[PDB]
Amino acid sequence: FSLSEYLTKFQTTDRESYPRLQDPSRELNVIIDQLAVSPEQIDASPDSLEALIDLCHDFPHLTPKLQTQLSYLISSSLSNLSKDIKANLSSNVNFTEIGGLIPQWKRHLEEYGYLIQVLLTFLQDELHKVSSQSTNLNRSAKNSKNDSANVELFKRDCNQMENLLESITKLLEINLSKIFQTTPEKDLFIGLFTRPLFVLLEIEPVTKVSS
Amino acid sequence: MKVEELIIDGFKSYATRTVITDWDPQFNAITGLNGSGKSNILDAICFVLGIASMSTVRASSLQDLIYKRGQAGVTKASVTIVFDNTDKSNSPIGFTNSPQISVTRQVVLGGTSKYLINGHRAPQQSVLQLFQSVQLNINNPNFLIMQGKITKVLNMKPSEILSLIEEAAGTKMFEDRREKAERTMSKKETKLQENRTLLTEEIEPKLEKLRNEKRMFLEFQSTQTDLEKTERIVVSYEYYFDLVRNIVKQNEGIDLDTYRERSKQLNEKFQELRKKVNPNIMNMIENVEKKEAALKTMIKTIEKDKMKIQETISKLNEYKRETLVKTWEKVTLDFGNIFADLLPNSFAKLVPCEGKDVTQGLEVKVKLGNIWKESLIELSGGQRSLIALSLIMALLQFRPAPMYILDQVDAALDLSHTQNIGHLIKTRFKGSQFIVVSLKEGMFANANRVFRTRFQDGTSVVSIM
Ligand SMILES: [Mg+2]
């Protein structure tokens, strides 16, 4: 797996013209069953690579239960992998074994960074869509029939947004100058984690909430 | 909208709170001696309906309408009018669920006026749109003949005689809004053209300079990777505690002096390209590319917006012209019949001007007997008063305005035509509230309500005679 050509495949080209998978539930549930016991095991099989990278790409085409459990998948996998690399690097172990796991660590981080990039990009797209045509979505008071579903969509995307930013806060505790060696690739990784936040901050009621 | 109460506070000849009630919905008639305040009652009604040109209210300013110019204790001038709404067919839009509509205009010294509907404040466009819906427009009236202006309706230019028929048809409120729309679109068009040439001259040159330094930044990032590989190898090889041994045993035996001068020749390009290009130009070019694309999409949508508005007003002009012709035929027929009934062995028609179109202006042509008058300047003041009154009543017979204000339309009519006008307002032209100021007894003796006006102690009073 590589980062830069996939990142310029997502960013420069069109994003909402991605193909639609015929049955997402069985493939994402067996992905869950792979990832309920091992968060790093997408690497070893390229069908799981392409399966994850295109079950993330169709994020405005799923059902909300599937969306929330995919967000919990991404947050749980990032939190477990960040805790594992933190427990490995903070210990007094030699540089040889952590250097042997550092291509696994760096390519797993490329995978998860691309997934977090596309989820935060589609999430800010949907939040800009639901907050553009509305008046005030900071609270659920003084609503209507469709407005209650609108503000419930607001709260559920903001809650999975909070879970994703929880995963991001859990990521950046590790010394990423150990993981990412040179400053172009480190700049690219921190930039792909920080760019969708800086485009998310355009939304006026997103900065109005507190968490 | 039959007027039910008129409350005048601090107006021209009215120093106190004068409340005029008991208005009959068919025919009200105001009388009194000279200098009593009748035309000031009509000026209060014109002022509460909204005036721009203060020469029809007979003032040179707005503080000239307050009592003794506001320098006699009454520093405010407020006019209140109350309309009944038992008939919902002539009701305005949105106000159907209110059986009484009150409109008040206030002016204090120094500043300008302010309007309130039913106690609650409102700007002037709200009350002007309220009164332009039951065709009670004072700025271009088809219901207001002020004092001494009854023998001068036939002296009007053909655009004004066209505008009366236009107000009867319902398209004057479209015509002034269309002219305002063309003026506003021209001003926003030259503003948008200035913005387009500013975009062409000032943005895309700097955008292509940004693209130039973008590709130089990809070259600088290639040298960046060159530094963080080669200089790291260099500082590792002069540092020689086991990791440096492991990164020595892949490149065993690299020459020192060539690597040192290669590091120097890389750092001189680095100190050049450090002051050449900023390291964060990729997010900057992404930001300005998104801004330029959204800007051009906005300009395309603005141009398509102007095209849609222009094609829609060009499509509405045809229905305006068709309803103007359909109004003009019925109005000139009822004009001829009402003038034949008022003055016997006579006739009058509304004709488009010589060679031009109906929508360019209209002219009155008068027949007395079997001969056509080539010019209506040779007619008397009484005949011209009868032609003007018959034109206003033909406009009533098309679509009756609720309030017809007549300030001494009988000053040039004789004692037969005055009684005939009073009878024809009492009997024939039912369907409007007439507020007529007269001094001839043959007009207000055929009245359903009579208000005397008197001057006492410095102020004016209205007594229900
Ligand atoms: Mg008078």
XYZ file of C-alpha atoms in Angstrom, chain A:
211
model
C 0.000 0.000 0.000
C 1.087 3.573 -0.708
C -0.243 6.972 0.319
C 0.474 9.798 -2.108
C -1.055 8.476 -5.324
C -4.167 7.355 -3.435
C -4.371 10.757 -1.740
C -4.168 12.560 -5.077
C -6.645 10.023 -6.447
C -9.151 11.108 -3.814
C -8.432 14.835 -3.618
C -7.812 16.000 -7.188
C -10.302 13.772 -9.007
C -14.044 13.672 -8.381
C -15.112 12.053 -5.108
C -18.892 11.538 -5.364
C -18.588 9.590 -8.647
C -17.337 6.422 -6.924
C -19.016 3.067 -7.691
C -21.699 1.459 -5.546
C -21.134 -1.968 -4.004
C -24.022 -4.408 -4.292
C -24.171 -5.735 -0.695
C -22.138 -3.751 1.850
C -23.492 -5.481 4.953
C -21.851 -8.898 4.557
C -18.446 -7.522 3.531
C -18.336 -4.874 6.257
C -19.547 -7.420 8.840
C -16.802 -9.891 7.941
C -14.419 -6.900 8.045
C -15.763 -6.288 11.577
C -15.168 -9.961 12.414
C -11.592 -9.626 11.146
C -11.211 -6.431 13.188
C -12.996 -7.513 16.371
C -9.837 -9.415 17.356
C -7.051 -7.880 15.206
C -7.038 -4.206 14.132
C -3.971 -4.474 11.903
C -4.927 -7.506 9.795
C -6.152 -5.665 6.674
C -2.550 -5.536 5.413
C -1.828 -9.190 4.634
C -4.577 -9.736 2.036
C -5.055 -7.353 -0.927
C -8.734 -8.235 -1.344
C -9.244 -6.882 2.182
C -7.169 -3.828 1.172
C -9.380 -2.997 -1.812
C -12.466 -4.039 0.180
C -11.771 -1.568 2.986
C -10.660 1.199 0.621
C -13.904 0.951 -1.334
C -16.233 0.364 1.620
C -14.967 3.682 2.932
C -15.244 5.440 -0.454
C -19.037 4.928 -0.654
C -19.777 6.651 2.659
C -22.714 8.826 1.407
C -24.335 5.646 0.037
C -24.716 3.533 3.195
C -27.462 3.338 5.884
C -26.986 5.231 9.192
C -26.543 2.153 11.430
C -23.823 0.910 9.063
C -22.263 4.391 9.082
C -22.069 4.580 12.881
C -20.611 1.102 13.235
C -18.061 1.859 10.490
C -17.105 5.017 12.397
C -16.759 2.941 15.567
C -14.617 0.512 13.531
C -12.247 3.273 12.407
C -12.046 4.875 15.860
C -11.527 1.523 17.615
C -8.832 0.396 15.170
C -6.940 3.692 15.465
C -7.175 3.694 19.267
C -5.941 0.104 19.590
C -3.078 0.583 17.106
C -2.014 3.883 18.696
C -2.065 2.266 22.146
C 0.035 -0.627 20.806
C 2.692 1.582 19.205
C 2.684 3.790 22.322
C 3.223 0.765 24.567
C 5.977 -0.471 22.262
C 7.880 2.814 21.905
C 7.473 4.005 25.514
C 9.048 0.767 26.769
C 12.812 0.224 27.014
C 12.999 -2.189 24.048
C 15.729 -2.159 21.402
C 15.459 -0.313 18.086
C 15.645 -3.517 16.003
C 12.188 -5.001 16.626
C 10.397 -1.642 16.527
C 12.268 -0.936 13.286
C 11.083 -4.269 11.937
C 7.508 -3.333 12.810
C 7.917 0.284 11.626
C 7.064 -0.490 7.946
C 3.977 -2.316 9.212
C 3.316 0.669 11.489
C 3.890 3.256 8.766
C 1.786 1.476 6.129
C -1.017 0.771 8.616
C -0.884 4.483 9.427
C -1.088 5.316 5.704
C -4.179 3.096 5.405
C -5.882 4.570 8.465
C -4.902 8.112 7.504
C -6.477 7.732 4.072
C -9.608 6.276 5.688
C -9.818 9.117 8.223
C -9.219 11.655 5.442
C -12.080 10.344 3.315
C -14.466 10.002 6.282
C -13.794 13.554 7.502
C -14.078 14.874 3.930
C -17.435 13.204 3.267
C -18.592 14.175 6.762
C -17.823 17.845 6.183
C -19.547 17.562 2.787
C -22.720 16.193 4.392
C -22.526 18.703 7.261
C -22.175 21.594 4.804
C -25.151 20.158 2.910
C -27.373 19.885 5.983
C -26.275 23.239 7.449
C -26.476 25.206 4.191
C -30.254 25.108 3.667
C -31.124 25.507 7.367
C -31.504 28.379 9.833
C -30.182 27.150 13.197
C -29.001 23.634 14.079
C -27.149 24.257 17.343
C -29.959 22.731 19.437
C -33.016 20.526 18.945
C -35.517 23.130 20.179
C -38.310 24.627 18.023
C -38.236 21.956 15.318
C -40.654 20.385 12.830
C -41.278 16.990 11.211
C -38.274 16.909 8.860
C -36.319 19.401 10.992
C -36.165 16.872 13.845
C -34.577 14.323 11.508
C -32.285 17.095 10.227
C -31.030 17.966 13.714
C -30.808 14.267 14.600
C -28.584 13.853 11.539
C -26.622 16.863 12.835
C -26.179 15.273 16.263
C -25.282 11.816 14.940
C -22.695 13.129 12.472
C -21.325 15.391 15.209
C -21.151 12.424 17.602
C -19.244 10.263 15.124
C -17.168 13.380 14.403
C -16.367 13.540 18.130
C -15.451 9.845 18.090
C -13.155 10.374 15.097
C -11.474 13.360 16.748
C -11.129 11.210 19.873
C -9.218 8.761 17.678
C -7.113 11.626 16.274
C -6.253 12.844 19.793
C -5.344 9.253 20.635
C -3.066 9.160 17.576
C -0.916 12.277 18.008
C 0.357 11.362 21.502
C 3.013 9.151 19.883
C 6.281 10.674 18.672
C 5.567 10.654 14.942
C 9.130 11.737 14.191
C 10.028 8.186 15.206
C 7.395 6.645 12.916
C 7.612 9.098 10.008
C 11.287 9.803 9.399
C 11.609 12.649 6.907
C 9.690 15.925 7.084
C 7.959 15.760 3.639
C 6.197 12.515 4.600
C 5.582 13.759 8.147
C 4.228 17.020 6.715
C 1.980 14.999 4.392
C 0.637 12.850 7.245
C -0.054 15.752 9.619
C -1.475 17.728 6.690
C -3.899 14.971 5.762
C -4.964 14.782 9.400
C -5.347 18.585 9.747
C -6.690 19.724 6.338
C -10.260 18.304 6.679
C -10.535 19.939 10.103
C -9.608 23.296 8.590
C -12.240 22.847 5.896
C -14.743 21.591 8.512
C -14.247 24.815 10.515
C -15.924 26.751 7.673
C -19.300 25.552 8.956
C -20.909 28.114 11.244
C -22.811 25.833 13.697
C -19.945 23.327 13.840
C -17.844 25.879 15.705
C -20.907 26.855 17.767
C -21.054 23.524 19.636
C -18.591 22.980 22.454
C -17.165 19.437 22.472
